[PDB]
RNA sequence: CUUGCUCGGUUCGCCGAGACUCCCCUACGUGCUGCU
DNA sequence: GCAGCACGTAGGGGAGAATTGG
DNA sequence: CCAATTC
């Protein structure tokens, strides 16, 4: 039973007015501001919002949060239930911490009592509420508009929707395509392929990029072109696929080509499908991001065919392998010991079902290709280059009393175990706001996933088995282990540890 | 495989290769050693 | 258990749709 | 046609 719904993001093309000014956003912000300030006793009093119209009306009347004109039951149930669950979230954190601590105390003290030692004094368990009645760690306001059934996206129709300069496709008509006859574009026209790179054109299933894509015109050291943005923007808008969400009086228009590519690269749909089916492949409750301009869709329960299991280990591993050998009698394991030198070392095997025990059959080993290692080396160069800059910038912004001590640390004694905390905090703050650091941190994840995908692809070729299993042991060590453990969560492939 | 993102080559006319589980929010923690 | 190192980690909350009633 | 109930 498939139970995983990966996201798919689309771009906002136009708005009636900025998303932060909508009544839904205002009522969400007001509710979030009000609820978090409630004390421990006040939550029980103001915890009867109810899933009905009368209950919601009396909740808004009893308190003083302005409804801001937004009075929709489907949508206020999402705002209130999420907001009160965040209030219980901070309580649940300290509750589970104290539960683990009390289990430790119960084990240790009962063991000592069995040994005759009296139990130690009970520790002052932490409370989530501050001095008078307020939460110490007050939850922050969550900026997001959670769409619902009554405002589900629909294909654009100029008749019943506000007029915008770009056109709108027919919901029932088959969706358009790129340019198949790419080699037939005459010289001097957009998309023209010169007569020197025609032979070494890819034959594989590459994703087709249109000539106005930003990837073909962005600024890199080798690109001696011009990045005129207006021309690319209008050329891209001329061929958009608009879908619209109307919440009350406001509306928003999205570009649906993101959904098209999401269903295309996953292979769930083939070229030649309508917009109605394309929207039917996704949930009718997207999420709007006011800060970026991205609406995030998630696939329906059934669109993807993965199970999203857990990395079982220990005793359950043998039973998992036995059950899988009860399925098609060819299981190809791979061992991912992150050994010396190369970041990845693999060792394929095959096991049968010999009654009760397994019969492993070795099949050899493989190392990472040289191009991938070159890419990893270049990434590490870039990461170290940005690290040597951000650390220096953090050191510069330290207070003079701490700055002198840190300078002495650089100079050549190792002391001052009170400014290490300040250095750590300043470094975390700088890292959280450095855009280049975010880009290089996403690059690490992308490269790690590239390595895992390569290993999975090669482990299906050597063993010639469709179903595979992964064995791991507990720089790139942590990131690669995380990327390999995500396969159970994301793609459903079992991930055994040791 | 039409948008968006990342890395490269160029004759600058665009084509070679990738990831696709993502968001907010609050805390200062996590592993590796040296001695008790 | 209690210091020195590097490096980000940990843990709360999210991410619908059939029906049906005026 | 569109909110409101329900699980």
Residue numbers in the entry: 54 to 465, 537 to 598, 626 to 649
Question: Which text from the study accompanies this structure?
Answer:
To investigate the molecular mechanisms of Cas12j-SF05 crRNA recognition and cleavage of its dsDNA target, we reconstructed the dsDNA-bound Cas12j-SF05crRNA complex by incubating the Cas12j-SF05crRNA with a target dsDNA containing a ‘TTC’ PAM for 30 min. We determined the cryo-EM structure of Cas12j-SF05crRNA-dsDNA ternary complex at a resolution of 3.1 Å. The Cas12j-SF05 adopted a typical bilobed architecture, consisting of the recognition (Rec) and nuclease (Nuc) lobes, which resembles CasΦ-2 (Cas12j-2) with an RMSD of 1.534 Å over 364 Cα atoms. The Rec lobe contains several domains, including the PAM-Interacting domain (PI), the oligonucleotide binding domain (OBD), and two α-helical bundle domains (RecI and RecII). The Nuc lobe contains a C-terminal RuvC endonuclease domain (RuvC) and an invisible zinc finger domain (ZR), which is responsible for cleaving the target dsDNA. In our determined Cas12j-SF05crRNA-dsDNA ternary complex, we observed a 36-nt crRNA bound to a 22-nt traceable TS and 7-nt traceable NTS of the 55-bp dsDNA target. We could not observe the density of the PI domain, but we did observe that the bases of A-3 and A-2 of the TS, which are complementary to the 5′-TTC-3′ PAM, are recognized by two highly conserved glutamine residues Q202 in the OBD domain and Q127 in the RecI domain. Upon PAM recognition, the residue S336 in OBD domain facilitates the unwinding of target dsDNA by binding to the backbone phosphate group of G-1 (right inset).
By searching the environmental metagenomic sequences with the conserved Ruvc nuclease domain of CasΦ2 (Cas12j-2) proteins, we identified a new hypercompact type V CRISPR-Cas system derived from Caudoviricetes, named Cas12j-SF05 (or CasΦ-SF05), which phylogenetically belongs to the Cas12j family. The CRISPR locus contains the Cas12j-SF05 gene encoding a 737 aa protein, and a CRISPR array that consists of 36 bp repeating sequences separated by 35–38 bp spacer sequences.
